[PDB]
Design an enzyme around this catalytic site. Structure first.
Site, PDB file in Angstrom:
ATOM      1  N   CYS A   1       0.817  -1.208   0.000  1.00 28.03           N
ATOM      2  CA  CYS A   1       0.000   0.000   0.000  1.00 28.03           C
ATOM      3  C   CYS A   1       0.856   1.265   0.000  1.00 28.03           C
ATOM      4  CB  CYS A   1      -0.934   0.007   1.210  1.00 28.03           C
ATOM      5  SG  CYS A   1      -2.286  -1.197   1.126  1.00 28.03           S
ATOM      6  N   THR A 355     -19.105   5.886  -8.129  1.00 29.14           N
ATOM      7  CA  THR A 355     -19.567   7.268  -8.090  1.00 29.14           C
ATOM      8  C   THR A 355     -19.117   8.038  -9.325  1.00 29.14           C
ATOM      9  OG1 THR A 355     -19.690   7.327  -5.674  1.00 29.14           O
ATOM     10  CG2 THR A 355     -19.381   9.432  -6.808  1.00 29.14           C
ATOM     11  N   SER A 400     -12.350   9.183 -13.332  1.00 30.89           N
ATOM     12  CA  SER A 400     -11.645   8.401 -12.320  1.00 30.89           C
ATOM     13  C   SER A 400     -10.903   9.351 -11.390  1.00 30.89           C
ATOM     14  CB  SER A 400     -10.684   7.426 -12.994  1.00 30.89           C
ATOM     15  OG  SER A 400      -9.832   6.802 -12.052  1.00 30.89           O
ATOM     16  N   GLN A 401     -11.328   9.406 -10.126  1.00 30.40           N
ATOM     17  CA  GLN A 401     -10.633  10.223  -9.131  1.00 30.40           C
ATOM     18  C   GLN A 401      -9.184   9.781  -8.974  1.00 30.40           C
ATOM     19  OE1 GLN A 401      -9.332   9.603  -5.796  1.00 30.40           O
ATOM     20  NE2 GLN A 401      -8.769  11.777  -5.764  1.00 30.40           N
ATOM     21  N   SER A 402      -8.964   8.474  -8.848  1.00 33.92           N
ATOM     22  CA  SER A 402      -7.618   7.952  -8.654  1.00 33.92           C
ATOM     23  C   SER A 402      -6.820   7.926  -9.949  1.00 33.92           C
ATOM     24  CB  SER A 402      -7.690   6.536  -8.082  1.00 33.92           C
ATOM     25  OG  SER A 402      -8.268   5.651  -9.032  1.00 33.92           O
ATOM     26  N   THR A 405      -8.179   2.988 -11.483  1.00 28.00           N
ATOM     27  CA  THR A 405      -9.136   1.889 -11.449  1.00 28.00           C
ATOM     28  C   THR A 405      -8.934   0.960 -12.641  1.00 28.00           C
ATOM     29  OG1 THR A 405     -10.712   3.412 -10.413  1.00 28.00           O
ATOM     30  CG2 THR A 405     -11.558   1.294 -11.202  1.00 28.00           C
ATOM     31  N   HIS A 556     -44.183   0.326 -12.421  1.00 29.64           N
ATOM     32  CA  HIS A 556     -43.814  -0.888 -13.136  1.00 29.64           C
ATOM     33  C   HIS A 556     -43.346  -2.006 -12.207  1.00 29.64           C
ATOM     34  CE1 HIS A 556     -44.365   1.232 -16.872  1.00 29.64           C
ATOM     35  NE2 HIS A 556     -43.499   2.163 -16.512  1.00 29.64           N
TER      36      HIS A 556
HETATM   37  O1  G6Q Z   1     -43.120  -7.619 -13.597  1.00 29.45           O
HETATM   38  C1  G6Q Z   1     -42.949  -6.568 -14.153  1.00 29.45           C
HETATM   39  C2  G6Q Z   1     -44.158  -5.870 -14.845  1.00 29.45           C
HETATM   40  O2  G6Q Z   1     -44.748  -6.792 -15.769  1.00 29.45           O
HETATM   41  C3  G6Q Z   1     -43.740  -4.508 -15.498  1.00 29.45           C
HETATM   42  O3  G6Q Z   1     -42.402  -4.132 -15.192  1.00 29.45           O
HETATM   43  C4  G6Q Z   1     -43.931  -4.493 -17.015  1.00 29.45           C
HETATM   44  O4  G6Q Z   1     -42.954  -5.324 -17.632  1.00 29.45           O
HETATM   45  C5  G6Q Z   1     -43.824  -3.085 -17.600  1.00 29.45           C
HETATM   46  O5  G6Q Z   1     -44.928  -2.311 -17.134  1.00 29.45           O
HETATM   47  C6  G6Q Z   1     -43.760  -3.086 -19.112  1.00 29.45           C
HETATM   48  O6  G6Q Z   1     -45.084  -3.274 -19.644  1.00 29.45           O
HETATM   49  P1  G6Q Z   1     -45.261  -3.584 -21.194  1.00 29.45           P
HETATM   50  O7  G6Q Z   1     -44.270  -4.724 -21.507  1.00 29.45           O
HETATM   51  O8  G6Q Z   1     -46.741  -4.072 -21.335  1.00 29.45           O
HETATM   52  O9  G6Q Z   1     -44.956  -2.320 -21.934  1.00 29.45           O
HETATM   53  O1  G6Q Z   2     -17.930   6.292  -2.781  1.00 29.33           O
HETATM   54  C1  G6Q Z   2     -17.768   5.647  -3.783  1.00 29.33           C
HETATM   55  C2  G6Q Z   2     -16.318   5.265  -4.169  1.00 29.33           C
HETATM   56  O2  G6Q Z   2     -15.543   6.462  -4.239  1.00 29.33           O
HETATM   57  C3  G6Q Z   2     -16.222   4.400  -5.458  1.00 29.33           C
HETATM   58  O3  G6Q Z   2     -17.494   4.051  -5.985  1.00 29.33           O
HETATM   59  C4  G6Q Z   2     -15.378   5.017  -6.575  1.00 29.33           C
HETATM   60  O4  G6Q Z   2     -16.100   6.062  -7.216  1.00 29.33           O
HETATM   61  C5  G6Q Z   2     -14.980   3.982  -7.625  1.00 29.33           C
HETATM   62  O5  G6Q Z   2     -14.196   2.980  -6.980  1.00 29.33           O
HETATM   63  C6  G6Q Z   2     -14.213   4.579  -8.786  1.00 29.33           C
HETATM   64  O6  G6Q Z   2     -13.067   5.270  -8.251  1.00 29.33           O
HETATM   65  P1  G6Q Z   2     -12.245   6.265  -9.199  1.00 29.33           P
HETATM   66  O7  G6Q Z   2     -12.980   7.543  -9.328  1.00 29.33           O
HETATM   67  O8  G6Q Z   2     -10.856   6.414  -8.577  1.00 29.33           O
HETATM   68  O9  G6Q Z   2     -12.085   5.552 -10.524  1.00 29.33           O
END
Ligand code: G6Q
Ligand code: G6Q
Lengths: 647, 650
Positions: A1, A355, A400-402, A405, A556
């Protein structure tokens, strides 16, 4: 590290001073969780230092660096008053992984029972199993369970089979790395090469700081393959070198650093620094704008708290020198060249993890609006899994902050192979993504020391907006919109301060969720990213099941979770999606939901009222109450917000 | 929301035969809305049915249809023995997306305390607030908070200011729709027009069924403009069935007239006429909307996926010559290949179907493929171009956001393709071309066979787009043989129902579950998470496996239930690393993996198939798990809370 070495060449330092410097470096590299540290230096208590360079002494300990420092000054037969005109000390802090934490498994690792060669190592050697066999067949016995010992043992094997009595220390390390596989950053020390250091890296950052009251021979070290051919002071010999895996351990001593690249072999011989390779390219001595104060907590009890509450400053730092409100112009210097090339491309692709990916989601709409190009936003790991089609007229951004990644970096190389124009949005000078992209922007948020991304998210956000503003600066029909957004950036630092002044209201909300095991965060449009990022923060920092739900998806299926018991947070702002969000709110309340609402300035249960800003900037204000909420919840439950639980 | 009205002209039906027909028509539509229900029929207890058409009776109650059927019966005023030779009854089940599902907010609405005009409305009026302030000034008092009451209070305002003593019911309704904005599908009934029903539509479904032992006068009703009507030739016996869906009419007859936007249908003297058509036969068997021997529609539709998958491929896949032919796209594939980008737009499970096939579409077409949630697609005013090919995945073909996305893309000149399970739906009609997945009617609220049939349909399209690449011939053969073997493998998965049920007994008490997957199984963990949310009400969340190390993994401890999907494809090593991480955090995950695949003592072994088809097999256990969990927790898998099937409004 954490790697750190201090080489004083004709700069007299006592053994105490050297050890204090090593300990101090490890503290800069010491993050919450590390459980093994050590130091290597010249032993012997001969008043003249030139006779003590044949006894390398190691002090290694399990625990925090504080424990190591106590063991240092707690040494029986060790006089800390000996003065060394020339000396090399190496140090390391680690988060034990391969083996179990113990003094043996701590670094430095040695080549034998007399410490002829010692090495500190960041990374993993893939072929470490095979190497340990080859050396054991030659009589070398191992004492640690770490892959690092193979490095120490292998360099002695090369030494024990050298052709001439004066084969350079570089040549030996060159033969070592040629047998290594994987990722590593290394610093070597040996009794056979007193006062000399050799540092090399492959897929792991390693830099060298330099300091001297005398003029240096060059600011661009040329590469030497197998006159001012190396770096050294001109008037006299006095000079100090600092090897480190992170600038945080160097910036207090010097801001002049050299970032090594893969397979560079940097060596200090007779106080002169040269860089060798096997393959007029060179390595630049550059000035870091970082400063020690930026990696300190200050008056804050945690780095998470500091980095949340300093976002008024970091947002300003992100914009400094890049925005001119007198005439509504934006100038990211890193892109002023490729700006017209970029506009001739046909698609924007944002690739990132975690993030950093949320920052792309958070700005996707305004990028589409102001560039008029299609904008695809990809999770780096999934982007790679699918072998996503990329073309020469794609512009690919890597957030990428770092800047290190793995998936984001591999995505970069994937896109370069296919001829795409690559742009790095990073927060770490010298990082891999900042170098390997055609161009880029340093978001200049200052070092992020906390475990979770706070100011990095908001600075990435602002950076992408600034880029969008560059892409439409020649459109008459968009002048008003640019002005509106830019006056929003002008006012943003004070709006952030306004949000932070509602910290007391967030604590109250935190005590109401104290005992809750889940919380649903709902938003749409500009605040889809806000609800995804808040849910991640509360997962990562609070360890409770928070989930971001796109408001338009409620009917949905997910709306089935809403009842009188399920905590719900809804982000409802006064933009074009306002009436829709009012609908979602009526749907939640209709199902016995009692939600908390983060609403715009002067819009059921408690409401967090953030100030009104431009629609494409509200995300910055609306995410901050979620940052603070995770912080305060974690504090209430006894957690250390700076102690990571991912590992 | 469902519509159903029964008009028996010169067919004597007692007051119990009509009430048991209105409720029976609502149960056929209950899956479209089960927060309340109501009926509107004629009151009065006079033997001479002619002296009863002036008295309307409304029976509306909160709850499913079974809460209404019990409210209709065991009454102390309604004599269920009056013989009606001519009668009209309107019914309606409501999806109370807003406000309370109280009887006052249910349909049929009324225009006054004596019920002179009652209307059942499906949709939303986008200017009911303007219509409510106008009627309140002329001397009309409002009772309910719905926008349907502004349609009842308004048809009476046109009747209170007509020009002639006998203005047709069509005229009054024609004046109402001219003041109604938005979409709507209405069915009126008034005491001033006994036995007369008016059925107009605009952006909402509405058909009229007809049954008659006598010959029908025609089969193409001519649309008129302010030898013309459909009716039996010699005798007067005829039974009409107004309804917003064909499932509530198929039980009585298979002869319906699908109206069009602004068609003001009217039944006067038992003669159906249209103002401002083609009497056709339905291609649906009653067995297709019957649970059979299963205890729920959802269970049937899961276990029938071996069949529905075959139906999706019937007449389209030939395994001897390895050819795929989708008639709906036979011609456009030429122009589609010259395009430069695919965009898949859908909601919910239909969106997951696109995620589930995105990779193979990129592989076989070599084109960029963008998958968009419809609601977000509209929020951002996403850029679309003339050389985009935009796909719209909708089981119902009426989902509001997906339909508006379609019209958005058409405005920008894109080529649009519909992937639906409903013939005549808006999305199937308004796309340039498309495919009917032909999975049969889906009655359960949660989509099961629709997902797998959409999955199969998008793969078949991909196979067409590369049938001329020499380099991809072997890959196509690999996939098509996978499709050939897919029905039997689905049977192999279904045979593990009991093993899935045992696992459910170990989880039903938990509050949360994380479902992790990547690559082809990113969609699997998203769809499984959505299902467990929808019918079980557990807090299940899908997590892309590659993102674990970036924050969410902190949520894993020995107490957090975890399901991982680890398959023997190109992400196997990566998924083994994710599994190691989960265990390091003390997680004890259930692993769904291949038969030939450790620390895991809780495994669900599915058979191994082609990598780009495995998602079909890996999702089914999660369907079954959701089903069994919901049973253990005492919930109804067919009628989950807080929603219904098909989101056709805001
Ligand atoms: O279990 C999930 C539901 O069935 C719902 O997410 C549905 O898939 C959407 O409302 C899309 O509906 P349509 O496919 O009829 O556009
Ligand atoms: O709180 C969330 C962390 O910070 C994490 O999700 C980070 O964003 C990723 O690991 C990418 O890191 P880099 O920005 O360095 O690529």
């Amino acid at each position: 590290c954490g790697i750190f070495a201090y080489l004083n060449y004709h700069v007299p330092r006592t053994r105490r001073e050297i050890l204090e410097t090593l300990i101090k470096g490890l503290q800069r590299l010491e993050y919450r969780g590390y459980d093994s540290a050590g130091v290597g230096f010249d032993g012997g208590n001969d008043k003249d230092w030139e006779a003590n360079a044949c006894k390398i002494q190691l002090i290694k300990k399990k625990g925090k660096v504080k424990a190591l420092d106590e063991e240092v000054h707690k040494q029986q037969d060790m006089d800390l008053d000996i003065e060394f005109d020339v000396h090399l000390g190496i140090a390391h802090t680690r988060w034990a992984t391969h083996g179990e934490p113990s003094p043996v498994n701590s670094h430095p690792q040695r080549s034998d029972k007399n410490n002829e060669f010692i090495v500190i190592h960041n990374g993993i050697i893939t072929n470490y199993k095979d190497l340990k066999k080859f050396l054991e067949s030659k009589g070398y016995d191992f004492e640690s369970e770490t892959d690092t010992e193979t490095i120490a043992k292998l360099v002695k094997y090369m030494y024990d089979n050298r052709e001439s009595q004066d084969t350079s220390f570089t040549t030996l390390v060159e033969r070592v790395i040629q047998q290594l596989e994987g990722a590593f950053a290394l610093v070597f020390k040996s009794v056979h090469f007193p006062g000399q250091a050799v540092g090399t890296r492959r897929g792991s950052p390693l830099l060298i700081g330099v300091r001297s009251e005398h003029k240096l021979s060059t600011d661009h070290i040329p590469i030497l393959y197998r006159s001012t051919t190396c770096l050294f002071p001109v008037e006299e010999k006095a000079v100090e070198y600092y090897f480190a895996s992170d600038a945080s351990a160097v910036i207090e001593h010097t801001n002049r650093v050299i970032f090594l690249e893969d397979d560079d072999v940097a060596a200090v011989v007779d106080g002169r620094l040269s860089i060798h390779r096997i393959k007029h390219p060179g390595r630049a001595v550059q000035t870091l704008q970082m400063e020690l104060q930026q990696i300190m907590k200050g008056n804050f009890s945690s780095f998470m708290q500091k980095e949340i509450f300093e976002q008024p400053e970091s947002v300003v730092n992100t914009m400094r020198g890049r925005v001119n409100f007198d005439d509504y112009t934006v100038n990211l210097g890193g892109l002023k060249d490729h700006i017209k090339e970029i506009q001739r491309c046909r698609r924007l692709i944002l690739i990132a993890c975690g993030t950093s990916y949320h920052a792309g989601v958070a700005t996707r709409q305004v990028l589409e609006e102001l560039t008029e190009l299609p904008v695809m936003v990809e999770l780096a790991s999934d982007f790679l899994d699918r072998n996503t089609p990329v073309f020469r007229d794609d512009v690919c951004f890597f957030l990428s902050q770092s800047g290190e990644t793995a998936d984001t970096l591999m995505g970069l190389r994937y896109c370069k192979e296919r001829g795409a124009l690559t742009v790095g949005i990073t927060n770490t000078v010298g990082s891999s993504i900042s170098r390997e992209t055609d161009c880029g922007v340093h978001i200049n948020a200052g070092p992020e020391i906390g475990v979770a991304s706070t100011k990095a998210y908001t600075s990435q956000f602002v950076s992408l907006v600034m880029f969008a503003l560059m892409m439409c600066d020649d459109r008459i029909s968009m002048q008003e919109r640019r002005k509106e957004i830019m006056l929003g950036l002008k006012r943003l630092p004070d709006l952030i301060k306004e949000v932070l002044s509602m910290d007391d209201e967030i604590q109250k909300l935190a005590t109401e969720l104290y005992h809750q095991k889940s919380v649903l965060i709902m938003g749409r449009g500009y605040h889809y990213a806000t609800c995804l990022e808040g849910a991640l923060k509360i997962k990562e920092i609070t360890y409770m099941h928070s989930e971001g739900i796109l408001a338009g998806e409620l009917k949905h299926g997910p709306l089935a979770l809403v009842d009188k018991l399920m905590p719900v947070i809804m982000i409802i702002m006064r933009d074009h999606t306002y009436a829709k969000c009012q609908n979602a709110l009526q749907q939640v309340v209709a199902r016995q939901g009692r939600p908390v609402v983060i609403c715009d300035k002067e819009d059921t249960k408690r409401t967090i009222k953030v100030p009104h800003s431009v629609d494409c900037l509200q995300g910055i204000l609306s995410v901050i109450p979620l940052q603070l909420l995770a912080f305060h919840l974690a504090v209430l439950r006894g957690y250390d917000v700076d102690f990571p639980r991912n590992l």
